[PDB]
Design an enzyme around this catalytic site. Structure first.
Site, PDB file in Angstrom:
ATOM      1  CG  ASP A   1      -1.650   1.267   1.549  1.00  0.00           C
ATOM      2  OD1 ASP A   1      -1.651   2.169   0.676  1.00  0.00           O
ATOM      3  OD2 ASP A   1      -2.230   1.380   2.644  1.00  0.00           O
TER       4      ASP A   1
ATOM      5  CE  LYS B   1      -1.790   7.408  -3.211  1.00  0.00           C
ATOM      6  NZ  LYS B   1      -2.121   6.279  -2.313  1.00  0.00           N
TER       7      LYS B   1
ATOM      8  CD  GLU C   1      -5.043   3.896  -2.214  1.00  0.00           C
ATOM      9  OE1 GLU C   1      -5.890   4.652  -1.695  1.00  0.00           O
ATOM     10  OE2 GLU C   1      -3.943   4.301  -2.648  1.00  0.00           O
TER      11      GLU C   1
ATOM     12  CG  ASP D   1      -9.265   5.197   2.631  1.00  0.00           C
ATOM     13  OD1 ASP D   1      -8.667   5.646   3.643  1.00  0.00           O
ATOM     14  OD2 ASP D   1      -8.674   4.666   1.663  1.00  0.00           O
TER      15      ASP D   1
HETATM   16 MG   LIG Z   1      -4.739   4.603   2.372  1.00  0.00          MG
END
Ligand SMILES: [Mg+2]
Ligand SMILES: Nc1ncnc2c1nc(Br)n2[C@@H]1O[C@H](CO)[C@@H](O)[C@H]1O
Length: 390
Positions: free
Chosen positions: A12, A73, A177, A201
């Site tokens: 991840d 990211k 994800e 999330d």
């Molecule tokens: Mg995450």
């Protein structure tokens, strides 16, 4: 005949923290790094003598803000002129430069000014995750599944593969994800028939809601929604502002202009915030916070809940929006999955469970580990090479 094959890993590659797992002996092992941490900060620091990655980078950020890179990211696969990039740059202490309308982070490193593409910084984080896995397995690792947000476009996905290739990894697949979190719970192994799954999330800086439909192990992304301005750091900020006011009332002193005192306060607030997820109150004890004054106090879970009340409630707006976009009613969702450390907050869990009329939340796999867990499950499946019997 045929030599034993090395295990493949699931990574991840997170905005703030990254996590690595391996599927062996019919189960996933989330691998701790050499400081005993099951998640590793997605940070890279540069000095005159070293390049530090993970905990070593994050632990020295206070005095080296210009040369400690995080949040790559948010730049990966984006143009320098992208409005998202332009806004984010105002919050970062490190330099972001324009190279042919492609952002690069520029730092002082080993006696020189050096600029890196976001994929190069992410490759450094991926090299650390590969080494964490190899320290546990005791042999070199080649194959990996890497996850990305469901909203990532082709450029963002290709730049993530490029980061894996720079790190010396063979990227088996780039997977979403929310899909990986669903795989972690075996939600693609329930047989024939459609299942609607909502992934909730809540990260350090952003909140994402995804609705997936699973039919015979096939995933379809039905809707994505969220809030780019909602995360764990906003709850830390509310506690910081509360304790700054408390110090003013109690000692008639405003600490807000001593960066060290504010930083020590924020660090303590984040730990107190974590304690409040398991306890109904938490102490805060800082020695010589400002002008040699010891700051020994407490906060109840009820007061923290009141401080962040509007922020916690606002998580339900993207849930309602995602449901309208998927053209589904809340009763039609079969499974609710929690992702992100901030989902351990009891009040966040209660608000969401109440919204779905008392339904159980899948939270048995540590929410900061579920994405790597699913990625490790998929990596083991992808390297199988079974030849059929007659
Ligand atoms: Mg995450
Ligand atoms: N037990 C926990 N209760 C509340 N929050 C938590 C917990 N554990 C983690 Br991890 N967090 C927060 O998750 C985010 C991940 O970037 C950060 O804001 C962490 O503070």
């Amino acid at each position: 005949g045929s030599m034993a094959k090395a295990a493949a890993i699931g990574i991840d590659l997170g905005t703030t923290y990254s996590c690595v797992g391996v599927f062996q002996h019919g189960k996933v092992e989330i691998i701790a790094n050499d400081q005993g941490n099951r998640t590793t900060p997605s940070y890279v620091a540069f000095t005159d003598t070293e390049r530090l990655i993970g905990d070593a980078a994050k632990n020295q950020v206070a005095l080296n803000p210009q040369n400690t890179v995080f949040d790559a990211k948010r730049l990966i696969g984006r143009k320098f002129g992208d409005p998202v990039v332009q806004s984010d740059m105002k919050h970062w202490p490190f330099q972001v430069i324009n190279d042919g309308d492609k952002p690069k982070v520029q730092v002082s490193y080993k006696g020189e000014t050096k600029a890196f593409y976001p994929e190069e910084i992410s490759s450094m984080v991926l090299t650390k995750m590969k080494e964490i896995a190899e320290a546990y397995l005791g042999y070199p690792v080649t194959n990996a599944v890497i996850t990305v947000p469901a909203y990532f476009n082709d450029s963002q996905r290709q730049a993530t593969k490029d980061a894996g290739v720079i790190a010396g990894l063979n990227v088996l697949r780039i997977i979403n994800e929310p899909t990986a979190a669903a795989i972690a719970y075996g939600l693609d192994r329930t047989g024939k028939g459609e299942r609607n799954v909502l992934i909730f999330d809540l990260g350090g800086g952003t909140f994402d809601v995804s609705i997936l439909t699973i039919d015979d192990g096939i995933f379809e992304v039905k809707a994505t929604a969220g809030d780019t301005h909602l995360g764990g750091e906003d709850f830390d900020n509310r506690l910081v502002n509360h304790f700054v006011e408390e110090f003013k009332r109690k000692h008639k002193k405003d600490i807000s202009q001593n960066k060290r005192a504010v930083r020590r306060l924020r660090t303590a607030c984040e730990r107190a915030k974590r304690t409040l997820s398991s306890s109904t109150q938490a102490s805060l004890e800082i020695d010589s916070l400002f002008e040699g004054i010891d700051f020994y106090t407490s906060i109840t879970r009820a007061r923290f809940e009141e401080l962040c009340s509007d922020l916690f409630r606002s998580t339900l707006e993207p849930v309602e929006k995602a449901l309208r976009d998927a053209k589904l009613d809340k009763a039609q969702i079969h499974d609710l999955v929690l992702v992100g450390g901030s989902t351990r907050i009891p009040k966040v869990q209660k608000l969401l469970q109440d919204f779905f009329n008392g339904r159980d939340l899948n939270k048995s796999i540590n929410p900061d580990e579920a994405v790597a867990y699913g990625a490790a499950v998929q990596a083991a499946i992808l390297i199988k090479s079974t030849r059929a019997a007659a």
